[PDB]
């Protein structure tokens, strides 16, 4: 069948919850209480942490902000739909689908 490792057709990104990054096993990154959770990136939470969800989904606000900043530098002056020429076929916002 299709080989995502070669042709870049990924379909399992929706199966992540948390990412923790630290250097020298003692200092966390990015630290400096940049995010709501000052130790790790929380991709998504269950109904318990609904106070931090966004976009009518289970994806947390900070992760959504990070993805928008990484792709189109959008978020420090209010979210909006990026220009069509800036979100290509493999871009993030193009393939983001909320369901309930």
């Amino acid at each position: 069948g299709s080989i995502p490792y070669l042709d870049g057709t990924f379909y399992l990104n929706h199966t992540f919850k948390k990412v923790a990054i630290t250097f020298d096993s003692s200092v966390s990154w990015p630290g400096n209480d940049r995010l709501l959770t000052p130790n790790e990136f929380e991709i998504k939470r269950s109904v318990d942490g609904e106070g931090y969800n966004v976009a009518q989904c289970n994806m947390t606000k900070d992760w959504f902000l990070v993805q928008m900043l990484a792709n189109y530098n959008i978020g420090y002056q209010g979210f909006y739909i990026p220009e069509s020429y800036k979100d290509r076929m493999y871009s993030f916002f193009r393939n983001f689908q909320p369901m309930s």
Partner: protein
Amino acid sequence: PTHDVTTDRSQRLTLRFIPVDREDTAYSYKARFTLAVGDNRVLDMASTYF
């Protein structure tokens, strides 16, 4: 650029504000917040949302 573009100290990115008083009538309700912008910071009102 390396310098004079962003701070390196500890500073929150987002902030959550809890109402200090909420009054409700039959067909509407009023909520008040004390939006406090910290020192050495600038807030773009377009970023805020209820």
